Amino acid sequence: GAFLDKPKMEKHNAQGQGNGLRYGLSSMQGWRVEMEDAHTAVIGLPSGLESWSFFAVYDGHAGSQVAKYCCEHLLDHITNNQDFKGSAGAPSVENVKNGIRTGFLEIDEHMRVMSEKKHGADRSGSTAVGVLISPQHTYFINCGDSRGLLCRNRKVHFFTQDHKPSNPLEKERIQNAGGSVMIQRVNGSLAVSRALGDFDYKCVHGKGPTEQLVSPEPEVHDIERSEEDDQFIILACDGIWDVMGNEELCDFVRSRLEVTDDLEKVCNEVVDTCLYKGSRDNMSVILICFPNAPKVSPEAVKKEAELDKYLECRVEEIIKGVPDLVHVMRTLASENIPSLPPGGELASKRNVIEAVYNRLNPY
Ligand SMILES: [Mn+2]
Ligand SMILES: [Mn+2]
């Protein structure tokens, strides 16, 4: 358990386009000593799933080994089993849902034998959250306390339910496998009830793979796609959700998209806003936009430039000792400034305020 002295605020990004989609992503180490988040983003899938896409965020714990194996290999474990393939034609919803379950259980066991065989020292685990997108369905996948959501028609249409040890059915499984839930933790240690890896928590005799202290079983939800109404999907680790809620972030992302179509930038902005809202964890966001995502608006761009200029003049005037940035931020908050981004608040404007502060007080 250690934090860095100062956060590693450096961004790792990707982006792409195809199958009517556009995506951006951003990942940042932040205040933590290691980076244990991993991701997947592929448009167009092997073996005849050209018109399919896959996006996933993995939040690694006690190492990045499991998360990194998952990020390169969960997809083929899901599509390359007989449950997914199943029926001779195009996979049915059940084939897809079963294929994913099997993919999760098989990669877990696969990693377990690799660890046993090679005498592996790490005792890592990882959450997974993602979407498999077909031409007519969005299949949400969740295992752990990473979270995904769908914005349809300017609202949160669906979000994944985090697997927390104290959730009634999780708690039950844990207690049946000989453990307990202490406050929010499996036996007072583990803050998640579902994950890949964590093999010390999967050693209960007389219980199946999905009946252990920690379960690798995913939750899958089929959502019929809507060309008219579907706007965007957000996937992120708990380093994001710990400080922003579903409605807030969805409102925030909308506001950003009305100013840029640069999706990596929107994602940088989310991650930075979350660092400034007090998040001290690793942060990873993926943003998948559909054709009817919010568009850039001439007024929105202007309003934002007006706000930027306004905050610059406020910083200049506040500086007139010389107040430090913490004190400038404090003064600005107490002003109750109108028209700040929804959900992002003053935190979402810190880079603009600090750039100004740095121009006036560079030493
Ligand atoms: Mn982690
Ligand atoms: Mn985390």
Swiss-Prot record:
N-myristoylation is essential for the recognition of its substrates for dephosphorylation. Belongs to the PP2C family. Mn(2+) 2 binds at residues 59, 238, 281. It comes from Homo sapiens. Monomer. Interacts with SMAD2; the interaction dephosphorylates SMAD2 in its C-terminal SXS motif resulting in disruption of the SMAD2/SMAD4 complex, SMAD2 nuclear export and termination of the TGF-beta-mediated signaling. Interacts with SMAD2; the interaction dephosphorylates SMAD2 in its C-terminal SXS motif resulting in disruption of the SMAD2/SMAD4 complex, SMAD2 nuclear export and termination of the TGF-beta-mediated signaling. Interacts with the phosphorylated form of IKBKB/IKKB. It is an enzyme of class 3 (hydrolase). Its main location: nucleus. Enzyme with a broad specificity. Negatively regulates TGF-beta signaling through dephosphorylating SMAD2 and SMAD3, resulting in their dissociation from SMAD4, nuclear export of the SMADs and termination of the TGF-beta-mediated signaling. Dephosphorylates PRKAA1 and PRKAA2. Plays an important role in the termination of TNF-alpha-mediated NF-kappa-B activation through dephosphorylating and inactivating IKBKB/IKKB. One of its GO terms (cellular component) is plasma membrane. Keywords: Cytoplasm, Hydrolase, Lipoprotein, Magnesium, Manganese, Membrane, Metal-binding, Myristate, Nucleus, Phosphoprotein, Protein phosphatase. One of its GO terms (biological process) is positive regulation of canonical NF-kappaB signal transduction. Its cofactor is Mg(2+); Mn(2+). SUPFAM superfamilies: PP2C-like (SSF81606), Protein serine/threonine phosphatase 2C, C-terminal domain (SSF81601). It catalyses: O-phospho-L-seryl-[protein] + H2O = L-seryl-[protein] + phosphate; O-phospho-L-threonyl-[protein] + H2O = L-threonyl-[protein] + phosphate. Pfam families: PP2C, PP2C_C. It is a lipid-anchor. This is Protein phosphatase 1A. It is found in: Nucleus; Cytoplasm, Cytosol; Membrane. A lipid is attached at residue 1 (N-myristoyl glycine). Residues 22-290 form the PPM-type phosphatase domain. Mn(2+) 1 binds at residues 59-60. PANTHER family: PROTEIN PHOSPHATASE. Its EC number is 3.1.3.16. GO terms for molecular function: calmodulin-dependent protein phosphatase activity; magnesium ion binding; manganese ion binding; protein serine/threonine phosphatase activity; R-SMAD binding. Binds 2 magnesium or manganese ions per subunit.
